[PDB]
Symmetry: C3
Subunit: 402 residues, 3 copies
């Protein structure tokens, strides 16, 4: 009976929902207290907007029967099915759409206008996430007998749980947004001057990191597509990817004597988790440890590099979700068991199609949003006024009276 798998997917979707709690804590604690309420408002609003969009038409665009191969075109206002796994799958996939979009808020914090962020959320949920999703995962409908692969999927692109599909998409859109709104006031000065701006509730960011970690077990577990005796290995690999991402960054912080090491260590854990998201089902425990640990290190160096580039990513979305997601997606070709690849593929062939997916994601999730958000910003400024930035977005639109 379809019962055990349905129950499994539903519990995994519950775990994905706790990731939304995780992000709210992670982001809100990493900002100053004068912004922390606006952060909270962004994090509940995006969830509601994304869920409404995904239910109304995003699931249709992503998973419906492919019209030309670019997009799906049935499953609007999702309700009834003759596929007894589909409804569980739909709920789980709705939680992934919410995850991809909510990544963006942490990069743009402390100076993006609320309504501006919600419009970006609409673009993510309505167009960018479901269309890329179709291309990578369009054929991958749980319990379906009549599915057709998206075009990247058809070429052999592998992404077990969304290193590219969820995390890179969000990260590319975040990068676009921070380039357009610009750095916080007081972040960068002179030519090479960098000031750190620290959050006011870093303990809540640690809670948040643990909630994200917990949720990631559902994120990866619910993507497995079945139950067999190798499911527990996905969970070990998830644990090792996160813990080695953190451990490696802890070692680096001890070695470098890093200021506010906590932020780097937590980001290391998250980067480790993102990197194994592509391959949790296809690698050994040693390679999970390796891929996660490397991901952690990369997040550390990428944080430092973004600062040198005068790009202000408040919680390090790009180091964690984008650099981690790219690394994980390419790492799959280096480390995964080749039996998970198309029969006619070497590791070089697999590397090339993983790379094509990475580049395609970048062109569509960075290039198109960059152009569209730059256009929106010209007629509807996305950056708050200086007064609102200085007083804090708690005092912004829909907040407190100053």
């Amino acid at each position: 009976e379809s019962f055990l798998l349905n129950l499994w997917i539903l519990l995994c979707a519950c775990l994905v929902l706790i990731m939304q709690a995780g992000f709210t804590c992670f982001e809100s604690g990493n900002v100053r207290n004068k912004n922390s309420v606006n952060v909270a408002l962004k994090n509940v609003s995006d969830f509601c907007v994304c869920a409404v969009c995904y239910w109304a038409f995003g699931y249709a665009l992503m998973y419906g029967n492919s019209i030309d191969g670019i997009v799906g075109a049935n499953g609007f206002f999702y309700s009834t099915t003759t596929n007894s796994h589909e409804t569980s799958f739909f709920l789980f996939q709705l939680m992934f759409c919410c995850t991809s979009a909510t990544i963006i808020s942490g990069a743009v914090a402390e100076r993006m206008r609320f309504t501006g962020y919600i419009l970006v959320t609409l673009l993510a949920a309505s167009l960018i996430y479901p269309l890329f999703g179709h291309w990578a995962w369009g054929g991958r409908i749980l319990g379906s007998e009549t599915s057709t692969p998206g075009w990247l999927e058809q070429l052999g692109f592998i992404d077990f749980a969304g290193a590219t599909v969820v995390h890179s998409v969000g990260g590319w859109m975040a990068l676009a947004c921070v380039l357009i709104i610009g750095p916080r006031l007081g972040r960068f000065n002179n030519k090479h001057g960098v000031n750190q701006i620290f959050g006011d509730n870093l303990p809540l960011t640690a809670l948040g990191t643990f909630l994200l970690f917990l949720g990631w077990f559902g994120f990866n577990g619910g993507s497995y597509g079945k139950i067999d005796d190798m499911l527990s290995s996905v969970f070990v690999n998830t644990a090792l990817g996160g813990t080695f991402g953190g451990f490696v960054v802890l070692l680096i912080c001890i070695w470098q004597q890093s200021l506010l090491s906590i932020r780097f260590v937590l980001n290391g854990v998250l980067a480790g988790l993102v990197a194994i998201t592509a391959s949790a089902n296809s690698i050994s425990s040693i390679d999970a440890a390796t891929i996660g640990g490397i991901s952690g290190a990369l997040s550390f160096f990428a944080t430092i590099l973004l600062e040198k580039c005068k790009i202000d990513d408040v919680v390090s979305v790009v180091p964690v979700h984008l650099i981690g997601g790219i690394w994980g997606t390419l790492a799959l070709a280096i480390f995964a068991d080749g039996q998970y690849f198309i029969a006619g593929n070497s590791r070089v062939d697999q590397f090339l199609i993983q790379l094509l997916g990475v580049v395609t994601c970048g062109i569509f999730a960075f290039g198109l949003p960059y152009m569209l958000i730059r256009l929106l910003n010209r007629v509807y400024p996305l950056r708050v006024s200086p007064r609102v930035e200085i007083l804090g977005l708690n005092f912004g639109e829909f907040g407190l009276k100053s």
Copy 2:
């Protein structure tokens, strides 16, 4: 084997327990910091008191073989059974008793004496919740072969997971309490003057709302009574009810330019969830969206209305749990598939018995507590002294030294 259903109910009970974490966060962040520790003490104490009461005799009163039909009279000090689903069921039902009662603390915050609140908790757990529970749900014992319906249940009253039984009961008792202790100092002035009093950790209230949301999946899932292929639809409906409650309130807040929109949006999500609690198993996804969205709107207008009535409900218990619970309970007759009704019932017949349950709940959970708490208050003042209100209940009985 009874194994899968038992495991399911136990995991669902775990999820209900995280709702207690949710309430603690939701309430404590919505008060001023000088009250937030007292809030925490209320939220752990009520859980322990309710659990002890329910185990000792509340489960007997609620689910035991009906003595005259008003009350059960076996299952005291719950221990052993020959029903292999009963023990899981008992634990799940204990978590519901704790949920109904803990709703009350959020309405009465910042000026109800701790011991006064614990006495109200005893009244909820010992008398009001289990007796109403018997009348609505007395026959509904998981895996039982020999159960007899309560009298409302027998008449056709439907409440899938406790829009009335849990949420309205708590809300009615909360209303009684706020009318008796009166408004906070500084809340209302002149004839029409209203001051907002904002909480000091609104990010924690967003965390809390997500924890409540997560828990609600267990709340509804554990009430399903079995496993079949339509269980996943309960989870979709739960997701849509919450997300549409929030989305609708977000739209209203954008339209009205509302002050401290975050509080209304979070309350919209919770109201949406409460409304679908009555009918999650019997409605379509579109109707879940509709019922939840309407519930959200109602919570917004009900908040404003309570202020006009000079009734001080700190976290908006009555807008969320009582107005949401009533709306959901009546909505069941409008929207649910008629195959879930007694064979001899039109939608009008179903509307009338839903209404009878609503009114019966009000008379017993508002009318009786109003009379008993007004009596208690005469000999044991439930409102703190002005000094304790001003300094904060952190400095009250069992708190800090001033």
Copy 3:
């Protein structure tokens, strides 16, 4: 098929992971804000260090085929198995190693150097936890056909989920640490003078207590070793142990009019849970209530006693985890159904072997760490400098610039 049990163990391991979130909240809220970030850094770092150690060799030492009976010697870098339950089991057991060690941070807070704590964590994870674990639980490998019992296990020592193995081990090592680093500045004065030092985010400690509670269901549930119709009784007993621990302390606090009752009540809940950890599978609901309630009372009196001894245990690790763990381990002989004992054992025989395990744990987890940590402290001071204590460990190594 092994499927349902594997899925069960994996969900239980997820619940154990939320206990790590619980500890982070419980500890960080119970310290002053100038220490709360260091607390968070300790709580994520220890998790990563323990996981790496347990994966690399701790699981080998604890559960590998016994070399002389003191220690295991295979399962290094855990990867592949022919036991289809082993991988799930390994992940669950990794979470237990992390739990035992992370207990220590709460006792030593506000004046132990970060690197000093991480070294103690290495000692816990690398030597103390896995070797004691072997002696108590070495034969208890899920789904194994060829296991040999550890020497205490062989003598009849019973510990269902780790009242001794997890909680007493951590508590003994915590005691050693607080004796060596000494009391916080301003805690004790004159000869009998005691100042309370209160945490700055006690609401977060209530959240933490609920997260711990929730996790404990997985902690006990995942230790059951199978699925049968008595599993739900483990969950009832867990609920009752916690709720009676809290309720009993609430009564005592009301009776004594105790200052900052919240801290005692939360600790009562945790102590109740620790005590039932030894016996959740082998006692009635009444005895769970009794054992938990007594555990709560003991935690209250033990807190007061430690102060009289001028021992500074910040969050009351020793009252909760050590006194609770000892009480629970001995209580098993008094209350458990004798069918769970070796056939040739009276309750007196069972009491004696429970006591031998308690004493053995103390000699090895207190005596050896006391000697080794006193030695480490001579060449690498574990107590922060007075300046760092006064300014707060947020400004310590790896923290903020002062």
